[PDB]
Amino acid sequence: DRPRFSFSIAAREGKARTGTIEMKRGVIRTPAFMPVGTAAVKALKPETVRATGADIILGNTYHLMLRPGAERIAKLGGLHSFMGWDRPILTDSGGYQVMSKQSEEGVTFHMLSPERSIEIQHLLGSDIVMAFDESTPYPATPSRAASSMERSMRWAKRSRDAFDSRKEQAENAALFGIQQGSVFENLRQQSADALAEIGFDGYAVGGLAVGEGQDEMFRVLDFSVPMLPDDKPHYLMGVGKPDDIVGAVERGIDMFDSVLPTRSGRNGQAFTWDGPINIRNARFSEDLKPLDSECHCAVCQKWSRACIHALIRAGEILGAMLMTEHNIAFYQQLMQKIRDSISEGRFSQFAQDFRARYFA
């Protein structure tokens, strides 16, 4: 038997936690990195993405709405059938890409509201559904940030009720709420209280990674994450670089997603424990070592820097495929070392060792 959504914390160190989310389509090890998915020849195969270590992938609701459309994905059997991925899928609400009519009802651009966003995510058949919120701009006036937070909370309630109105969705999926409030601690507290009063399966910290820089993002995390319910997962959306991830786990974040491994891989850039490298650099043309000396991904078991350099410089799509697979696998190995070090009570030392070497 498998539960709808069950978060268990197995070990803690400071604010960091490691554990599992059990869902009907599988178990998610936390802290978790979710690669951002696309349709299943122009992308990695889903078995390849699974083999990198990913327990869950993300679907971009806005892009799926535009092509091929949510009703079409439903007729094809849902997003799992469409993507060839049978493990859990999280979908965002589509609201951020709308920004990236505009009344309290929702927006038209296609129409999106709390109710329509929840309905589209049900048509996709995703396992974790994000509430529809309003993104405060960056930077945000204290006036504008107060406005978008309060609208987001009324929309979070509407998301809650829309989700609960479909037995098939409410019995089989989970719903996450999104805290807003920008850099204003009192707003963040009001937002957290509102979401906790409504009740969600997990809570995301919104309004971050939108240009504010890491020091400010960390300062906001420092007081925002403790406000959320301790016994539910904490999600930092769209983050990020490896050092962003490590420091966010130090501050209590359990879940992450980012296109960065894919964007980097397509641009000829590989993540390594010694920092990112540009594989086109001449120093790699005769380098017989793998992309990363310690990475145990399938690419680093077989391919040298020299030969990936050759593929990338020739514009062979295989080069970008190999880079992307390694980058996503590197991210999963980072999450695994994070999980292991929390379990063994040496995560704070892991983070310091990681930073000293990554920025050396």
198 binds, among its own copies, Zn ion, none (CB under 5 to 8 A by kind): none
Answer yes or no: 257 catalytic. yes
Per-residue CA distances from 217 to 188, 223, 251 (Å):
13, 11, 11
Does 304 participate in binding its own copies (rule CB under 8 A)?
A: yes
Are the beta carbons of 59 and 89 closer than 8 angstroms?
Answer: yes
Is 293 annotated for ligand binding? Answer: no
The one among 150, 219, 307, 348 contacting its own copies by CB under 8 A: 307
Answer yes or no: 353 catalytic. no
Is 126 annotated for ligand binding? Answer: no
> Which residues contact Zn ion (rule: CB under 5 A)?
295, 297, 299-300, 326
Handedness of CA 235, 69, 156, 142 (dihedral sign): positive
242, containing H or E segment:
helix 242-250
Does 283 participate in binding its own copies (rule CB under 8 A)?
A: no
Give the integer Cα–Cα distance in Å for 51 and 46. Answer: 9
Phi first, then psi: what are they for 118, rounded to 5°?
A: -60, -40
One-letter amino acid for residue 192 of the chain = A
- Reading the block at residue 4, the tokens are 């709808």
Size of the site for its own copies (CB under 8 A): 12
Residues with Cβ within 8 Å of 52's Cβ and at least 6 positions away in sequence, in order, are 35, 297, 325, 328, 329, 331, 332
Does 302 participate in binding its own copies (rule CB under 8 A)?
A: yes
Phi first, then psi: what are they for 155, rounded to 5°?
A: -70, -30
Give the integer Cα–Cα distance in Å for 254 and 92. Answer: 17
Is 252 annotated for ligand binding? Answer: no
The one segment of 104-112, 206-214, 245-253, 301-309 that binds its own copies by CB under 8 A: 301-309
Taking the least distance from each CB to its own copies, the nearer of 170 and 306 is 306
Does 105 participate in binding its own copies (rule CB under 8 A)?
A: no
| Cα three-residue angle 290-292-296, rounded to 5 degrees | 85
297 binds, among Zn ion, its own copies, none (CB under 5 to 8 A by kind): Zn ion
The one segment of 56-64, 68-76, 262-270, 310-318 that binds its own copies by CB under 8 A: 310-318
Out of 55, 92, 201, 292, which one is annotated catalytic? Answer: 92
Give the integer Cα–Cα distance in Å for 48 and 110. Answer: 34
Taking the least distance from each CB to its own copies, the nearer of 63 and 302 is 302
Taking the least distance from each CB to its own copies, the nearer of 288 and 360 is 288
80, containing H or E segment:
helix 79-83
Catalytic residues: 92, 257
Binding-site residues, in ranges, read 92-96, 133, 180, 207, 295, 297, 300, 326
Residues at the binding site for substrate are: 92-96, 133, 180, 207
Residues at the interface with its own copies (CB under 8 A): 286, 288, 302-304, 306-307, 310-311, 314, 316, 318
Where is the binding site for Zn(2+), in residues? 295, 297, 300, 326
